[PDB]
Design a protein around this ligand. Sequence first.
Ligand SMILES: Nc1ccn([C@@H]2O[C@H](COP(=O)(O)O)[C@@H](O)[C@H]2O)c(=O)n1
Length: 302
Amino acid sequence: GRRAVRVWCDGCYDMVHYGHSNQLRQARAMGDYLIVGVHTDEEIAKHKGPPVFTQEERYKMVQAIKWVDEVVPAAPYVTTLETLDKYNCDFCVHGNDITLTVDGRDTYEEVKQAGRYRECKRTQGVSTTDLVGRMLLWTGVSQFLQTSQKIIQFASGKEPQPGETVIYVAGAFDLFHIGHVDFLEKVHRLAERPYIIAGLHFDQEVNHYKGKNYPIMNLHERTLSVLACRYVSEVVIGAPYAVTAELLSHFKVDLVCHGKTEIIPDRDGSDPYQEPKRRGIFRQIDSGSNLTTDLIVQRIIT
Ligand SMILES: Nc1ccn([C@@H]2O[C@H](COP(=O)(O)O)[C@@H](O)[C@H]2O)c(=O)n1
């Protein structure tokens, strides 16, 4: 009936960003199903420094990316034909980095010789070193070039259907991380057919209430980061800090959630959730995670 083409990727996925997401999207577009091998903390420490995020954090983050069908924990550092056969994958997909042994032989010679290796395009605008750099520091630093096409590639493109519960969440969603995934995952359980709209605050607003040099990622980068998450149906690309009556009617919102993090008051001292609270449609959800963008900055610099 086809047959199905099963695609393999592997990696560390330590500090996942929209570059990793875009690479996984590309890999999935080359077949029908995507399996991602993720290395253990130990295996990574053998080859380079130990990772910032624990293997179980990294596993969970990768599984939350909507193009990924399954995560294989404890994948070997280098892709082999044996691993591809074990998971019945036709080929693996990696970036175009030079990957040579000390001798000048390709790290992936085996897989490449068997014709089971594919390259995907490198993602413009981000890398893990760039993001580290931003964290060691509002007018914006990213050279990401957002386009209608990148949004189309990342967006599910679906409108709310009859029977679907529209649920609005809002925030910075900066350095979109496992705390956000845990939040969104719980929100997604609140209805049988959830349609989650994530409202992303403007860069200048985030800087105002989060301070310092925040946000690390600009509105356009955070747009792609949130759209990659399997729990998200739509994003408001520049949402007001106050959850307004206009927003609630425009999107026909059924429920509004916020996590157990602190809600900073609005410019005028008001509760930015006052309207949905008055309507009786506000629900606080405990994500069970204490991870914040501020604490990631701390784990990554230290
Ligand atoms: N660890 C975390 C981090 C964020 N969140 C929720 O995710 C949403 C977005 O958070 P930020 O604006 O801080 O990015 C908020 O509703 C916040 O309460 C959570 O519930 N648990």
